[PDB]
Symmetry: C3
Subunit: 71 residues, 3 copies
């Protein structure tokens, strides 16, 4: 969502730089901050999914042990 917002802002600045290529240095630097923010927002979500996978591993392990124990 914010990633989607940062991507659209980067898409906008990309069009401005390509049109300005056709002042440009500032937009190029700003575009690099746009991409860095996007990468950082994706890192946050990626970090959440890593933790979500670990919790699913713990849940399935508990079920596997429960079935083992019931035997």
């Amino acid at each position: 969502s914010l990633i989607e917002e940062l991507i659209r802002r980067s898409e906008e600045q990309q069009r401005r730089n390509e049109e300005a290529l056709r002042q440009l240095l500032s937009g190029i630097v700003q575009q690099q901050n746009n991409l860095l923010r996007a990468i950082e927002a994706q890192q946050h979500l990626l970090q959440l999914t890593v933790w979500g996978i670990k919790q699913l591993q713990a849940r399935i392990l508990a079920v596997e042990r429960y079935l083992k124990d019931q035997q």
Copy 2:
């Protein structure tokens, strides 16, 4: 795969810009579009994994409830 293809294209343009640093503004702008596409392709896959984690959570919850109910 496409991410891998976008990364290699970015790796190629990176070498051209570093060699051209040693016309450059256009390549720098094109490289920024290469990275934006890569970020967007990774966002698509990241979005798929978020949905895949939610479906695994629903599957393990159904198993957990089944075992609870059988008792």
Copy 3:
């Protein structure tokens, strides 16, 4: 972790470029390599989570089949 290290290095180069904007072309090119490395490191971790989700799917499927078979 390395992603976090590549992000901080990109954050440092971003500040230098914004201050140098206020030689800049080289830093802009170097910053683009900083972001490319970050994207590539995130792709590696993203690839690991895709594989981790597939293994969790196989584990829950085995549990689902076990419970089906016991009936």
